[PDB]
Design a binder for this molecule. Structure first.
Ligand SMILES: [Cl-]
Lengths: 41, 41
């Protein structure tokens, strides 16, 4: 009950974490693409 | 006992989120820099 409220907050944090892990990986892929353009030029 | 467990885990997840938000924002700031560099040379 307070245990359910906390289990739920925890689920939401773990979901945010999954989300942030993709978003940080994509940013990393874009940086490598922008650096590749810079290096080529 | 289990509520903290959950409390403990909630601290750990919030800590991982803070780290990922910083890594993301570092990369975003780097993307802005590469874009400015590229568009300006
Ligand atoms: Cl790179």
């Amino acid at each position: 009950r307070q245990l359910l409220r906390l289990k739920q907050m925890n689920v939401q944090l773990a979901a945010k974490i999954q989300h942030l892990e993709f978003s940080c990986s994509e940013k990393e892929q874009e940086i490598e693409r922008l650096n590749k353009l810079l290096r080529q030029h």
